[PDB]
Design a protein around this motif. Structure first.
Motif, PDB file in Angstrom:
ATOM      1  N   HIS A  29       0.822  -1.195   0.000  1.00 57.96           N
ATOM      2  CA  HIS A  29       0.000   0.000   0.000  1.00 57.96           C
ATOM      3  C   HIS A  29       0.864   1.255   0.000  1.00 57.96           C
ATOM      4  CE1 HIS A  29      -3.161   2.829   1.596  1.00 57.96           C
ATOM      5  NE2 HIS A  29      -3.831   2.176   0.664  1.00 57.96           N
ATOM      6  N   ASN A  30       0.245   2.374  -0.377  1.00 52.71           N
ATOM      7  CA  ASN A  30       0.961   3.644  -0.393  1.00 52.71           C
ATOM      8  C   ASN A  30       1.465   4.010   0.993  1.00 52.71           C
ATOM      9  OD1 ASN A  30      -1.192   3.666  -2.636  1.00 52.71           O
ATOM     10  ND2 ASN A  30       0.194   5.309  -3.256  1.00 52.71           N
ATOM     11  N   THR A  31       0.664   3.743   2.022  1.00 51.27           N
ATOM     12  CA  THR A  31       1.010   4.137   3.379  1.00 51.27           C
ATOM     13  C   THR A  31       2.132   3.302   3.973  1.00 51.27           C
ATOM     14  OG1 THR A  31      -0.938   2.853   3.981  1.00 51.27           O
ATOM     15  CG2 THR A  31      -1.127   5.236   4.016  1.00 51.27           C
TER      16      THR A  31
END
Length: 49
Positions: A17-19
């Motif tokens: 994920h981006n996070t």
DNA sequence: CCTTGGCGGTTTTTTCGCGGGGGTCTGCGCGTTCGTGCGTTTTTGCGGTGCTTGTGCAAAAGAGCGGCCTCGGCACCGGG
């Protein structure tokens, strides 16, 4: 480790994920069943106490 | 009240006495051997225990039953 198991698997939990940036390694993950579910902390990460 | 002990008189007779004769048996003394005490060493019957023993306390998918829905058609009932 992410204890989601094998039954009722889905691609979304296994994705990167981006996070995840800066907190877990984008490259290091096992192969096969546990791919994406097992994560490694980045080299400057910490866990709050 | 009536009898059974007592108190007396008399006779019986052997208790008891002195004397004798004998023999038994108890006591002294010597000899001894074996019986028990005294000893270092030891045992059977028993107290405490070992260990052998055992019994107790997570998706997806189709399928099926289910209950319910609806409906038509029938039958009991009506008008006439």
């Amino acid at each position: 480790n992410t204890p989601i198991g094998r039954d009722g698997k889905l691609a979304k939990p296994r994705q990167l994920h981006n996070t995840h940036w800066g907190l877990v390694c984008p490259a290091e993950t096992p192969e096969g069943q546990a791919c994406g579910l097992v994560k490694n902390l980045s080299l400057l990460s910490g866990i709050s106490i």
